[PDB]
Amino acid sequence: TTLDKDLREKVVGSLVLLRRKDVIDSVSLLTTLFPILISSPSKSLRTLIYTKIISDLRESNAKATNHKLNRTIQTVLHNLLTSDRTSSKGLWACRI
Amino acid sequence: MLTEEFVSAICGPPLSSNTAIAKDVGIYCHTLSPSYSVKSTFKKSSVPVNCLAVSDTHIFAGQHEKAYVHVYSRLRGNQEAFVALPERIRCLILIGDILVVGTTEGRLMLWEICTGRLVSTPARHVQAVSCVAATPSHVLTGSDDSDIHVWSLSQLLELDSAAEHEPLRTLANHRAAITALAVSPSDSADTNFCVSASKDKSCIIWNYQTGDALRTLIFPGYPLCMSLDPSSRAIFVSCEDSSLYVAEMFGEKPLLGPGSEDPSTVVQISTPFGATQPDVGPASCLSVSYDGTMLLTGHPRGQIMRWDISENKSPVELANLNAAVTNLIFVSPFLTSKPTKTVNIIKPSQAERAYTFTAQFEPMSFTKSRLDSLLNATGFPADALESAIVAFY
Amino acid sequence: MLTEEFVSAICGPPLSSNTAIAKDVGIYCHTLSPSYSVKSTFKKSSVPVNCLAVSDTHIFAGQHEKAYVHVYSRLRGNQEAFVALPERIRCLILIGDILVVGTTEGRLMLWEICTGRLVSTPARHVQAVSCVAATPSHVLTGSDDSDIHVWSLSQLLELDSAAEHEPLRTLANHRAAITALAVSPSDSADTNFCVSASKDKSCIIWNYQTGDALRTLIFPGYPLCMSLDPSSRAIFVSCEDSSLYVAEMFGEKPLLGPGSEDPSTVVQISTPFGATQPDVGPASCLSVSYDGTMLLTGHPRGQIMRWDISENKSPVELANLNAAVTNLIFVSPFLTSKPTKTVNIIKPSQAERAYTFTAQFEPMSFTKSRLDSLLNATGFPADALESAIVAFY
Amino acid sequence: PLPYKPRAYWDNIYRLPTTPNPFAYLNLFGLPRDEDSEMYPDRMSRLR
Amino acid sequence: TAPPDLRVVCHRLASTPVDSLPRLCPLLINHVLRCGGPLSEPQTSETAMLVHKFRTHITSLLTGKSPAGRFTAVCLIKAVIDVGGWESLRSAEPWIRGLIGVLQKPDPLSSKELSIVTLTKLYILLQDYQTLIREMATPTLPGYATACLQLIKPPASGRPLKVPLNFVDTVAWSLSKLVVLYSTTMRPFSGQIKSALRPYIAPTSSDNVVVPQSLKENSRNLLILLTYTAPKNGSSDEWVKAIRATILDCHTTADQVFRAVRESWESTTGYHIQPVNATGEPSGGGDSVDELPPWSGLQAGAERLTGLLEYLTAYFNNPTRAPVNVPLGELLDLTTRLTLVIPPSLGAEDSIETNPAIGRDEKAELWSALPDIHHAVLRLHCAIIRRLEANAIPLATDIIDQMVRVSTASKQLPSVRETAYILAKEILLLAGSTLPKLTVDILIPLIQSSCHDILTAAGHASTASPVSQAASALLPTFFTHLPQKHLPPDIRGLLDRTAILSHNQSAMLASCLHPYRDSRGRYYPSILPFLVRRFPRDESVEVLRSNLVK
Amino acid sequence: TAPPDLRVVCHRLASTPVDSLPRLCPLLINHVLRCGGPLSEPQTSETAMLVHKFRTHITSLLTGKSPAGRFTAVCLIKAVIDVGGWESLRSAEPWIRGLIGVLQKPDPLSSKELSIVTLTKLYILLQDYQTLIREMATPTLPGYATACLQLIKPPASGRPLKVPLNFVDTVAWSLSKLVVLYSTTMRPFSGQIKSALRPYIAPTSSDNVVVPQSLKENSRNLLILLTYTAPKNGSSDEWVKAIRATILDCHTTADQVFRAVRESWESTTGYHIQPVNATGEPSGGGDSVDELPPWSGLQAGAERLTGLLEYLTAYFNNPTRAPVNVPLGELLDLTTRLTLVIPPSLGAEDSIETNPAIGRDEKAELWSALPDIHHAVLRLHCAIIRRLEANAIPLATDIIDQMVRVSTASKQLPSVRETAYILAKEILLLAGSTLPKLTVDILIPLIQSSCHDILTAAGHASTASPVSQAASALLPTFFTHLPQKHLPPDIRGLLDRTAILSHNQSAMLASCLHPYRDSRGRYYPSILPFLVRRFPRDESVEVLRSNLVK
User: Fold this and answer.
1) CA C28, CA C7: separation in Å to the nearest integer?
2) Which parts pass through the membrane (chain D)?
3) Quick check: helix, strand or coil at residue C98?
4) C136 vs F contacts (CB less than 8 Å)
5) CB C231 within 8 A of CB E528
6) In this structure, which of B259, C78, E334, F386 has its CB flanked by the most CB atoms within 10 Å?
């Protein structure tokens, strides 16, 4: 919330770059990005985090279907919907 | 790493048309240490002064211009109940599993949240009950009639009660409306005290079980809000002059203790610990952290500010909530073991029913057996092992 | 009520030729409450001031200008020992099972009455050690060189320690011979104190673990002896001008505390609680009862005086011992459970031997068994009896 | 060292702490400290 | 380099004969507890080689023919699962089958009991890891429950149980520990457990079987925690139904017990006492599943009533899965009815109303059986106070009257006086500081009795007694949580003298913290000179001395 | 008229058959204990008739052929002696011979055990009245001793004991109670008791018999208290000779277990390390009366040495008839020798100088055998402290050295750490307030280990381990009885963190009352804001609020 916008999208892009360089894992990157995606007030931050999540899923399932990763993310989205029906946070899982 | 959390509430319309701050959110739950953040939000609430209560299961929020208390489940994080109390609400506190409500007509309401039983005292206060403090044996109700009444909980709440409830004592040395009440954590007959702040620019330290006035303090401004430090050494008061003062019980000139002067002698406090700017506003609510080194003040311009007594004379703004902050209550960083959990609440109802208690029984390990030692002991116990060997042979 | 008893000692020849008391008798054991009677007499001794010590099993009495401590068996009624010391005794006390002796040569000795060890210190003093006091941890020794030394008990009682023993501190603000010493009940470094009394017309209160001189008191006459009250509120002091004064430490003007004055500021006491005629003479020894209400004094003409601290009445003469009463010690009316009883003592011997401890072991229920519960319980325990039934069947 | 204060022991209990940033040596509400971020108030630990 | 403990373990298991391995079990257990690092490492070094050999030898002993080897295997498996963590947990899949085989085989019952404890420890430790419950706990647990119910089931009507009631107690304890964690798996066995442990809830003298106390609380806990296995979230409904059925059974038994005495008690809940047959011995119970086993005789009725009251106590001693509706009004009405019938003093038999037709021998049996019933009622009150804490303040007023009436009725009973002391301490620590003058006056004989017990134990009218310990614990509460203004001066003087003679440091601290005020206002003297002289080096006494004197 | 309890007792005894009397025994004992009045009165009213009939019933049941009636008579006799007084003491003369007949008859062993307990309690109560002693105890004691000794007598080498070791333990406990009060009567039997209880003083793993700890403790206590029966006041001489022989046996066993290592320990008392052959396993003991049964093997020698250390502990746990000379120099020399053998750390096998003619198996069995011996030494030091108190202040310094050395050797052993915490609490409470900076510095690692254990239990690094409990009982002592001027600021900070995060109210109060000065001389801020917020209405803060009492 409190960082500058350019610095915070640089941090997100650098985390995605470290995932590309295989320093960190896809599960670690997604568990970092997703609560910030659902709880961030910044529209640009939410848009870029959503774009990076979609790009990470595409790059993971491009060479072969990663059933474990898909199952974990689907379970996470299902829990997000199941936790609070009246909340509007499920639209991110819907868009994904 | 212990995490210190506090709960904030707002009242009234938003001060500025800012789309960043959500309009419908009433109650915020934050973190104070190590970094400020907003954990959770509760919507559709406008809480006046002294109408917020919090416990590990629920948040109780009395409503401005309504005779409603909103009950919020923290475990489920949502609106659980809309409790409609029969007559208007001015203040409320929570002491265990009972909500004590001071009303605007002078009545006192005791609502057991687990059994759904409501006890209504007769209107011994001829105007509105402004402040209510509670200890597990006493209830102190200070009202706008310049009167403070002391009640016994065991006398207020019992089974098969038909007699009208009468206060044990009345403390009426003030000359104006009682703004605030605080009570020392002690419960002994002679070591306890209570500090009462009224609109006659005075705070009186009383011994409420004996009904004796221990000390009288005069401030340039009448105290809007007032809180004792955790170790019962000092009082922090805000004033209408936007200034915050501190009074020490046991200093070089002690207010209480053997070295203190006569009770009839009145001490004047004129040295300001801190002050807030005119555009900030006087501190509407005050709260003290667990260690007691830090204070949080809520001001009707919407900002929550932190005071560090040792380090910073000037307070530091944490955030601006765009609406008048009326209550700040701290949550203890340690978890407390309680044999019952109040998962669901029971609404107040007037009907002929048997006295029923509704709570989930927590596992407190009250039952112990000899096999429990073998179960929780690493390896086998020596005596049980040799007994097993002998009975095998 | 409770039966208080006390022990008296005599030095010097009999003053009057004709008396009912026998001339040889040197030690009396009396009763103070509920009525005065002489329980027992111990035959031959001449005890100087501060040369008497009473335990639950023995009475130790140093002789006048001889290096001889007469030991009497309190549980047998006779004299057990004629223990000879390397140097003459100026003072002696008893702590636990160690007789602590200050000599005429500036030397401090510790005699372990159960093992036979005799630890000797180098002559750190340059005149005779007038007064001695002890804690479970420290030994205070004040002498005629206006010097008071603090010694570590464990350092003094270490077995194979061959290095020369040295005092930890030297409480030296006095300018004349130290007459008396008293020690506060507490042993913590921050809250204990010790009171001196010297021939420089004064008494100094010290913190004997930090070396600080906490208070200075000037009397109109130089103190001879003193005693703290059981609640550590007052220091009853006898002076050379035949008067008993009360030093109230924590009263209207506290000597010590938050309301106290500067330690450099000297407090002068001029109001006598009690006075004795020149016929009776000044009090040679003081002692205060278990309750603290009653006070006993010994006078060189043989009178025993009771003073009521609470009632503030006239002193009452109990009995006349026909010669100077140098010592008065109360025995506590209650008994402390001690697993080792010193039935007999071991005389000091300097020879190469293993460390041997001699005492009788008392039953203290240091072991437990499942059958002890069956024997001590009235009937049988239900679980054990049911187990006996199912073992029978 | 500072000289003796007659009313410091009881004021340490019955008065608020006057030390700036009190309870910093506890670190109850902060992150765990490694060797570099540990505090060394006395010259003995500093010299060591 | 494997540890010396590990290589001693492997060498001793290789060399020692299997029959004398149980004698060396205490050494091997301590050595395995020392072997922490080798067992916790993830799956060639000599450490890993000899860990593999040690586990192979454990499996060989467990699947071997020797009962001594099976006993040693059970002990070693318990030590390994207590030490090795998650690797030893996941390498325990054949060990669970072996432990079930020990129970199924005709092994000695000490080996069976150790297998039960080891399996319970396994099923408790597996709860931390979600996958391990999926792979190990849930497939093998129905087999474990089947083996336990096969051992515990009565083989025939005429044939008694082959196992002792201690083994019954061990099985009940294990199933009580497991129904909380694996409720849906233990659901089909709820019928057999409830039928098997039915006689042990409230055993009477007519059963001709001596039931141990530990088996009684374990049976009570199992039949209360069997409500966890209710389908479609019916745990709260079954709990409330069972506790209200128990209160009804208490009332129906109390009718047959109290048929000699005419009662003036009325029910706020609405229970009406049905008429009872005047002829014959009192009877109750049935062969039906919902009823308890039948009893005959007034002593049997009193034992049944005491067992039912202890079952109600176990209700407050056991946890619940979901929030439940506690019938506090019904329980208070039951305790009021059972406390209003009091034993007489010497010569009040003609004073209190009695049935004319009933026998005088049965009457004497009734008033001999009453103090046990009052003891059970006071224990139930203590459990209610402990579980509810500040929510028993509404209930607090009637408990005082019940305690005073019970203690004054039977003040000759040391057990009744003791439980009165614990209950008094509890209710005074909850609501004692604002009791009215009438309550303070009626609690005075309890104060005198407690002080008399303390002084008799101290010798200033003995040794340590439970009554004396309870009264000594109660003694500081008379200063801390009782109004000193309502106390007469003689009671305060007795309390101060009792504290001084008993050397109770907490009591003297409380007495000095709470000075006594008479009617005029004269300050009674403190006992601080006694406290400082008796306990000079205590830190609370030092603060009290330094503060009260100022 | 008659009391209802006595009426029910008589009616149950009349109606109930003898076979079902043991399962109605808890009824009868409770009612008899309630009926304290008429039995205590000297011995026509209904009370007197029922008491006479009741005593007649007791006599008939004890003389009856039914073992159930005999068991009921034993329990009823115990109850009557407990709540009957001097009248029952005089009327219990045939009851003694009846109880001895119950022991002699082939009756169940629970009945024999209860008869033994009843007889022991009867003699204990008979000791008060001197005429009753000469009337009853003097003729009957040789018969009871003869019966007990023929029960516990070993039949042959090939023939094992017919009675279990717990029954032997009960016999040993009864004789331990009786030898103190009756010395001259038990003097002829002193020879047979030593031969009977020789194999249970220090049992080894080479005897192939598992001996219970209660039997071991009672045999040790009885062989120590048999010095009461020494003729011509030889109690002290036999006590000193026995303890010196035990110390010599410890030294000789220590040679055989320590043949593997080169010892740098030189005796300050006179003992010399005799050479031990380096071929074959260590062995010791023998078949003679003055020495314990033989053992062969290093683990057996370690068990023998540990049992002898526990026998030395029982010397201080037991009382003495006359003053005795305790060989403290020999005890400290022995403990120094046993604690100077430190097992090596990981990868430090060359650290300890050792015999190169002895193999790894013996070496690494010794490195595992040391911690139990060290634990026994620490318990012996605890017993010496608990017996002497201020007379052990000369022993304070080197016992701290041994404790620190053992704790640093066995930091990974929870039992060793727990015993070290207990001994540290005892020594620091004794003479810990004047320890120098070197002693504080060498006690620092134990402080860190205790704080780590408490924080591990509290979850701030679950159930409470005994190690955690012993460290939490030691945490306030680190403030109260330790020089805070010699303590590093990091240690004080760790102690305050441990107290606050573990909610130790005594430790928080001790921290508030023993504040830590910095180098500037200023006090650290007090914990008290945490103590009041955790325990607001406790006695700990109620004492600190004494400045408001007025």
Assistant:
1) 6
2) none
3) strand
4) 390, 431, 433
5) yes
6) E334
CA E387, CA E380: separation in Å to the nearest integer? 11
The alpha-carbon gap from C244 to the nearest alpha carbon of chain E, in Å, equals: 21
Q: Which residues pair with C134 in a beta bridge?
A: C139
Q: Which residue of C has its CA nearest to E547?
A: C250
Calculate the CA dihedral of residues F421, F427, F429, F430 and round it to 10 degrees: 170
Phi, psi of B347 (to 5 degrees): -70, 150
CB contact under 8 A, F512 and D17: no
Helices (H) and strands (E) in chain D, counts: 2, 0
Alpha carbon distance C192, C256 (integer Å): 11
Instruction: Please name the helix (run of DSSP H) or strand (run of DSSP E) that holds residue D43, with its range, or none.
Output: helix D43-47
Q: Identify residue D16 by its one-letter amino acid code.
A: L
**Cβ(E250)–Cβ(E309) under 8 Å?**
yes
**In F92-198, where does DSSP find H-type helix?**
93-104, 109-126, 130-132, 138-152, 165-181, 190-197
Name the nearest CA neighbour of E34 among F372, F347, F297: F372
Q: How many CB atoms lie within 10 A of CB C34?
A: 10
Judging contacts by C-beta atoms under 8 Å, the chain B residues touching residue C259 are: 258-259
Nearest CA in chain C to B250: C258
Question: Is B78 in contact with A41 (Cβ distance < 8 A)?
Answer: no
B113 CA to centre of own chain: 16
The edge-to-edge listing of strands for the beta sheet with B129-135 is B129-135, B138-143, B148-152, B169-171
Is B340 in the E-facing interface, judged by CB distances under 8 Å? yes
Q: Are strands B285-288 and C89-95 parallel, antiparallel or unpaired?
A: unpaired
Considering only CA atoms, which of C149, C194, C186 is closest in space to residue C168? C149
Q: Spell out the alpha helix ranges (H) of F22-137.
A: 25-34, 37-40, 46-63, 67-82, 85-91, 93-104, 109-126, 130-132
> Quick check: B363 contacting C, CB < 8 Å?
no
C186 in contact with chain E, both atoms CB, cutoff 8 A? yes
Do residue F523 and residue D8 have CB atoms under 8 angstroms apart?
yes
Backbone breaks in chain A after residues (C–N over 2.5 Å)? none
Full 3-state SS string of F431-485: HCCCCCHHHHHHHHHHHHHHHHHHHHHHCCCCCCCHHHHHHHCCCCHHHHCCCCC
For residue A78, give the amino acid letter. H
CA distance B115 to B107: 21
Contact across the interface for C258 and D4, Cβ inside 8 Å: no
F368 contacts in chain E (CB < 8 Å): 4-5, 8, 31, 34
As a dihedral over the C-alpha atoms of residue C361, residue C365, residue C367, residue C371, rounded to 10 degrees, the angle is: 130
Q: Does F455 touch chain D (CB under 8 A)?
A: no
DSSP reduced 3-state for C300? coil
Please tell me the distance from the alpha carbon of residue E71 to that of residue E29, in angstroms, as a whole number.
12
Amino acid in the structure at residue E322: A
Our CA dihedral for B54, B59, B63, B68, rounded to 10 degrees, sits at -120
> Could you tell me the end-to-end alpha-carbon distance of chain D, in angstroms, rounded to an integer?
21
**Strands B78-84 and B89-95, how do they pair?**
unpaired
Q: Which residues contact F487 (CB under 8 A, 6 or more apart)?
A: F440, F516
Provide the Cα torsion E72, E74, E77, E79; round to 10°. Answer: -70
CB atoms within 10 A of CB E278: 10
CB F76 within 8 A of CB F58: yes
C133, containing H or E segment: strand C131-134
Q: How was this structure determined?
A: cryo-EM
> Rounded to whole angstroms, how far apart are CA atoms C78 and C344?
12
User: Quick check: C282 and C242 in contact, CB under 8 A?
Assistant: yes
Answer whether B2 sits within 8 Å of D29, measured CB to CB.
yes
